Amino acid sequence: ITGRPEWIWLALGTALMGLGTLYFLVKGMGVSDPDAKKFYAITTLVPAIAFTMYLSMLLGYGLTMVPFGGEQNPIYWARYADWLFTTPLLLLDLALLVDADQGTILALVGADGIMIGTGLVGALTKVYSYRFVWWAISTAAMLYILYVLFFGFTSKAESMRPEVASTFKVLRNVTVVLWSAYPVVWLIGSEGAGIVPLNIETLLFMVLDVSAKVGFGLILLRSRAIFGEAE
Amino acid sequence: ITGRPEWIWLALGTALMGLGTLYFLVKGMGVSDPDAKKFYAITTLVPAIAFTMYLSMLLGYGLTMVPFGGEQNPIYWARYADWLFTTPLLLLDLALLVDADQGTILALVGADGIMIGTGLVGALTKVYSYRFVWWAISTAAMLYILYVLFFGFTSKAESMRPEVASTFKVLRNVTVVLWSAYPVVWLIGSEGAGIVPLNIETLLFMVLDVSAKVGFGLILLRSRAIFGEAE
Amino acid sequence: ITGRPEWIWLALGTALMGLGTLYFLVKGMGVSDPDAKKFYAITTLVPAIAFTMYLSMLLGYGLTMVPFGGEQNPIYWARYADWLFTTPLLLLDLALLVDADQGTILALVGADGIMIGTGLVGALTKVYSYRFVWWAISTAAMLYILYVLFFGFTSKAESMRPEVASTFKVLRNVTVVLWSAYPVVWLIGSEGAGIVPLNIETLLFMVLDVSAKVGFGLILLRSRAIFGEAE
Numbered sequence: 001i002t003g004r005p006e007w008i009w010l011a012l013g014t015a016l017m018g019l020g021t022l023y024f025l026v027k028g029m030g031v032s033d034p035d036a037k038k039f040y041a042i043t044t045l046v047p048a049i050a051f052t053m054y055l056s057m058l059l060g061y062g063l064t065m066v067p068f069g070g071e072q073n074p075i076y077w078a079r080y081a082d083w084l085f086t087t088p089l090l091l092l093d094l095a096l097l098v099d100a101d102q103g104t105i106l107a108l109v110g111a112d113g114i115m116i117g118t119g120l121v122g123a124l125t126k127v128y129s130y131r132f133v134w135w136a137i138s139t140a141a142m143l144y145i146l147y148v149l150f151f152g153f154t155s156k157a158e159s160m161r162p163e164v165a166s167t168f169k170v171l172r173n174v175t176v177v178l179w180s181a182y183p184v185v186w187l188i189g190s191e192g193a194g195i196v197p198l199n200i201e202t203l204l205f206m207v208l209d210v211s212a213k214v215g216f217g218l219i220l221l222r223s224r225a226i227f228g229e230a231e
Numbered sequence: 232i233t234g235r236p237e238w239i240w241l242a243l244g245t246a247l248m249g250l251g252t253l254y255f256l257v258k259g260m261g262v263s264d265p266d267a268k269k270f271y272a273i274t275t276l277v278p279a280i281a282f283t284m285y286l287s288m289l290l291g292y293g294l295t296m297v298p299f300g301g302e303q304n305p306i307y308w309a310r311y312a313d314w315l316f317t318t319p320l321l322l323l324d325l326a327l328l329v330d331a332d333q334g335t336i337l338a339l340v341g342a343d344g345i346m347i348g349t350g351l352v353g354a355l356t357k358v359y360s361y362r363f364v365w366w367a368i369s370t371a372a373m374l375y376i377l378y379v380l381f382f383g384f385t386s387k388a389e390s391m392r393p394e395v396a397s398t399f400k401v402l403r404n405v406t407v408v409l410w411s412a413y414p415v416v417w418l419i420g421s422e423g424a425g426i427v428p429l430n431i432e433t434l435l436f437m438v439l440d441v442s443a444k445v446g447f448g449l450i451l452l453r454s455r456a457i458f459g460e461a462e
Numbered sequence: 463i464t465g466r467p468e469w470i471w472l473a474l475g476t477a478l479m480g481l482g483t484l485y486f487l488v489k490g491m492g493v494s495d496p497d498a499k500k501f502y503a504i505t506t507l508v509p510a511i512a513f514t515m516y517l518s519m520l521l522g523y524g525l526t527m528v529p530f531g532g533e534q535n536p537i538y539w540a541r542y543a544d545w546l547f548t549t550p551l552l553l554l555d556l557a558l559l560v561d562a563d564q565g566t567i568l569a570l571v572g573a574d575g576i577m578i579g580t581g582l583v584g585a586l587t588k589v590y591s592y593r594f595v596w597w598a599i600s601t602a603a604m605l606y607i608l609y610v611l612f613f614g615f616t617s618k619a620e621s622m623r624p625e626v627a628s629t630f631k632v633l634r635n636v637t638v639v640l641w642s643a644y645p646v647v648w649l650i651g652s653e654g655a656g657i658v659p660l661n662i663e664t665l666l667f668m669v670l671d672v673s674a675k676v677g678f679g680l681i682l683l684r685s686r687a688i689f690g691e692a693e
């Protein structure tokens with residue numbers, strides 16, 4: 001395990017996701033409100049899935065070698081397995097907060113699936129120049145998602161409770177900033193142009209992942225917006 | 232890319248799915264009705280997914296070699312990845328049109344999953360005679376789906392709005408004819424008996440795919456059946 | 463096929479799932495009640511999926527070799543493909559019976575996904591001692607599911623119809639006993655410590671699978687709890 005310099009960040013990531021999972025699990029024990037239960041379920045599952053995939057990367061299972069540029073390049077494929085399930089759960093948290101219509105939710109989840117799926121294909125593609133074609137398609141799917149979060153959701157939040165409108169606005173802003181960093185790190189890291197070494201890349205993704213999951217969850221689950229308006 | 236004679240049909244397929252995706256995306260921009268949004272979301276996602284998988288076939292990612300009959304046989308596995316997601320979306324379009332009950336929808340999607348999954352296993356099976364066992368099981372799942380579309384849905388459409396009944400009937404008929412061709416092409420093509428060469432097989436699937444997705448979508452999204460009855 | 467001593471149990475399993483599938487399919491033909499249709503759909507799909515995966519194991523497709531302990535160890539990976547889809551369907555049968563809230567259903571299905579997914583990783587892991595780390599995480603996800611079935615569902619059933627409360631209690635008890643045997647068989651069988659040989663392991667899983675699917679389904683589909691209260 002320690003044979004890879006990036007192991008320290010995989011281990012820290014595993015620990016922080018594990019701790020985040022346990023914290024949300026305990027916190028949600030005292031919850032009976034049916035609406036709050038939905039948000040706790042979604043939000044606890046996110047770091048639990050990430051915990052398993054960080055562990056698989058730490059132990060070496062979630063790593064494969066991909067030939068491109070005349071080299072055997074270490075590619076952590078387990079990231080995409082994580083993201084396939086956790087990024088639509090994160091979007092679902094946002095969509096339920098603002099009572100999004102079903103068509104909009106399906107558009108978001110579908111675009112998200114395309115985003116992660118094409119990122120996976122790009123990560124595993126052996127023809128170097130083609131990796132960036134997949135990156136571009138994935139990034140276009142991301143831009144669609146960000147567009148919807150701003151010009152379909154923000155003006156939906158404003159007709160809702162003030163506490164859900166303010167909580168949505170904060171989580172929207174956190175999401176757009178954090179999620180936009182992922183394609184940049186991929187592009188300059190070992191999957192793309194290879195300018196930033198894998199150990200630093202792994203650190204960067206770990207900070208983004210913990211912030212986008214445990215950070216996000218801490219903000220959401222401390223808000224009164226997750227509860228039905230009750231006396 | 233041009234090293235494979237079937238590349239021209241993969242390229243045309245990619246282009247037509249891409250163009251179809253953009254057309255539906257633009258067309259649905261001016262839509263606020265919650266019901267119509269569902270149909271636009273579902274129907275736009277279908278060629279978008281197909282676009283990505285056609286591209287993966289064009290670039291060579293979605294192709295593998297399978298030993299059977301003492302030969303290395305080129306198998307485009309990306310078709311099944313496409314179909315796994317797009318065929319239940321197509322069925323969902325039909326089921327929502329007639330306000331199908333939840334049990335019926337689950338039966339359809341489940342049978343569809345079995346249909347595509349067993350087709351994939353058959354496509355990748357190395358014992359030649361066993362490929363046709365999987366083809367038979369998949370075809371039985373197809374026949375179940377077609378049965379339900381006729382003797383569970385058609386008489387559901389007739390108690391609904393005339394515009395939804397007439398639109399459903401047309402899309403049902405398009406679906407049954409087009410979908411029934413797929414097992415025949417598989418059986419006589421490079422996956423099955425090998426009587427029709429891969430380049431012609433690829434052409435045939437491209438015509439079926441564009442018709443079943445973009446053709447289907449053009450009929451559906453031009454109907455007033457996708458809108459709630461409103462003043 | 464007969465080259466593997468466990469083939470007889472794979473063949474019997476295939477037959478019993480096939481027969482169970484046909485029986486439930488015929489039985490549900492005379493059903494119009496929308497609630498009952500849901501239970502028939504879910505419950506018929508379960509042995510149908512299991513039939514396909516038992517067949518893939520019989521024909522040899524669903525088997526791979528995994529190096530650990532200095533040996534090539536036969537691992538039937540198709541079990542996890544089965545279980546990935548059938549165990550959440552089984553939980554859905556239980557959850558719908560007691561009209562579980564959406565948050566609880568998502569927690570169950572999510573924990574179940576983690577349970578099966580980590581079992582799959584453990585089954586395919588090449589470092590022997592690490593296989594048991596994945597077994598432990600999977601078992602913890604199982605224990606969560608069993609906890610919810612007892613201390614979240616049982617007291618939900620009691621405020622419902624007596625026929626649904628009594629049917630739920632029986633199916634809950636069947637589920638907890640049968641499902642708890644699976645991690646034990648894995649641990650002592652060819653995936654784990656290797657004390658029980660593969661042919662006996664295969665027998666054990668076949669008895670558990672038929673009981674947990676066809677047995678379970680026979681109890682559920684003969685109950686009046688699956689019908690809406692109607693005059």
Ligand SMILES: CC(C)CCC[C@@H](C)CCC[C@@H](C)CCC[C@@H](C)CCOC[C@@H](CO)OCC[C@H](C)CCC[C@H](C)CCC[C@H](C)CCCC(C)C
Binds near residue numbers: 110118124283308311
């Ligand atoms: C509604 C939304 C969910 C829409 C989803 C959007 C989605 C369509 C976007 C594209 C997804 C698609 C790229 C998934 C591809 C998975 C694939 C990378 C798995 C690895 O297999 C690739 C090659 C080795 O590189 O296998 C070597 C050759 C092997 C023989 C491969 C044969 C097995 C195939 C992988 C079977 C395909 C199954 C499905 C792709 C399962 C989807 C997995 C998940 C990653 C989407």
Ligand SMILES: CC(C)CCC[C@@H](C)CCC[C@@H](C)CCC[C@@H](C)CCOC[C@@H](CO)OCC[C@H](C)CCC[C@H](C)CCC[C@H](C)CCCC(C)C
Binds near residue numbers: 315340355525
């Ligand atoms: C409700 C509905 C959805 C019901 C669904 C119906 C469904 C049950 C029908 C059968 C689906 C099942 C056949 C999927 C099999 C996928 C498999 C072909 C992927 C390729 O792996 C096959 C061999 C190489 O040929 O791998 C070589 C050996 C490797 C070590 C394989 C180990 C990895 C396994 C593939 C893990 C299994 C994961 C699940 C099958 C994911 C499902 C993928 C999708 C195609 C259904």
Ligand SMILES: CC(C)CCC[C@@H](C)CCC[C@@H](C)CCC[C@@H](C)CCOC[C@@H](CO)OCC[C@H](C)CCC[C@H](C)CCC[C@H](C)CCCC(C)C
Binds near residue numbers: 575582583586
């Ligand atoms: C809401 C709930 C559903 C939550 C779900 C919980 C879930 C997160 C729990 C963990 C699931 C995760 C372990 C699935 C891993 C599948 C993996 C074993 C498939 C086989 O690939 C493993 C190695 C060979 O051993 O591939 C060799 C290297 C290859 C290059 C691998 C590259 C292809 C990757 C497999 C692509 C990943 C796609 C997704 C994992 C699809 C999920 C399949 C299913 C088994 C969950």
Ligand SMILES: *C/C=C(C)/C=C/C=C(C)/C=C/C1=C(C)CCCC1(C)C
Binds near residue numbers: 116179209
């Ligand atoms: C918890 C993990 C999260 C929130 C991950 C988010 C990841 C993305 C938004 C990834 C986006 C990518 C692209 C837009 C193109 C390049 C490849 C990706 C997959 C890194």
Ligand SMILES: *C/C=C(C)/C=C/C=C(C)/C=C/C1=C(C)CCCC1(C)C
Binds near residue numbers: 346350370410
């Ligand atoms: C957009 C793509 C569509 C509508 C594809 C439909 C495909 C089928 C109905 C495929 C059916 C098959 C069988 C019935 C058995 C042989 C294998 C298949 C998968 C080709």
Ligand SMILES: *C/C=C(C)/C=C/C=C(C)/C=C/C1=C(C)CCCC1(C)C
Binds near residue numbers: 600
């Ligand atoms: C129809 C099949 C059923 C009901 C299978 C149930 C399987 C399980 C509950 C498996 C549990 C496992 C663990 C808890 C850890 C070890 C690995 C598994 C996957 C066997």
Ligand SMILES: CCCCCCCCCCCCCCC
Binds near residue numbers: 181185196197200
């Ligand atoms: C969105 C953030 C992307 C920028 C990442 C900056 C990383 C700077 C680290 C120094 C680069 C290491 C190069 C020498 C090894």
Ligand SMILES: CCCCCCCCCCCCCCC
Binds near residue numbers: 412415427428
């Ligand atoms: C459902 C349509 C299946 C029939 C396809 C007919 C294809 C005819 C093309 C000629 C066959 C090529 C054989 C000589 C290369």
Ligand SMILES: CCCCCCCCCCCCCCC
Binds near residue numbers: 643646647657662
């Ligand atoms: C939950 C049941 C697990 C116990 C399984 C008992 C199997 C006993 C069979 C005898 C073991 C075979 C060892 C000699 C080959």
Ligand SMILES: CCCCCCCCCCCCCC
Binds near residue numbers: 085089092105106113
């Ligand atoms: C490819 C995996 C996509 C599914 C991820 C799980 C999250 C799905 C959330 C469903 C949202 C509800 C839509 C109506």
Ligand SMILES: CCCCCCCCCCCCCC
Binds near residue numbers: 333336337
């Ligand atoms: C194996 C992939 C199956 C899922 C495909 C996505 C479409 C699912 C549509 C869900 C229909 C709603 C059922 C209640």
Ligand SMILES: CCCCCCCCCCCCCC
Binds near residue numbers: 575
């Ligand atoms: C990884 C596969 C998980 C999906 C299995 C299919 C069963 C899903 C049942 C959905 C229950 C409804 C939740 C709201």
Ligand SMILES: CCCCCCCCCCCCC
Binds near residue numbers: 139143147150180183
């Ligand atoms: C186009 C929608 C406006 C809100 C999205 C902001 C786009 C940020 C760009 C992210 C950088 C990705 C490379």
Ligand SMILES: CCCCCCCCCCCCC
Binds near residue numbers: 378414415
């Ligand atoms: C049995 C249901 C009647 C409607 C379905 C028509 C079946 C068409 C056969 C398709 C050919 C597949 C090989």
Ligand SMILES: CCCCCCCCCCCCC
Binds near residue numbers: 601612
């Ligand atoms: C902790 C919840 C109480 C009900 C679950 C009973 C646990 C049975 C243990 C199963 C054995 C697995 C190794």
Ligand SMILES: CCCCCCCCCCC
Binds near residue numbers: 129132133136
């Ligand atoms: C070796 C790099 C070749 C450049 C490929 C860039 C493709 C980016 C596509 C953006 C439309």
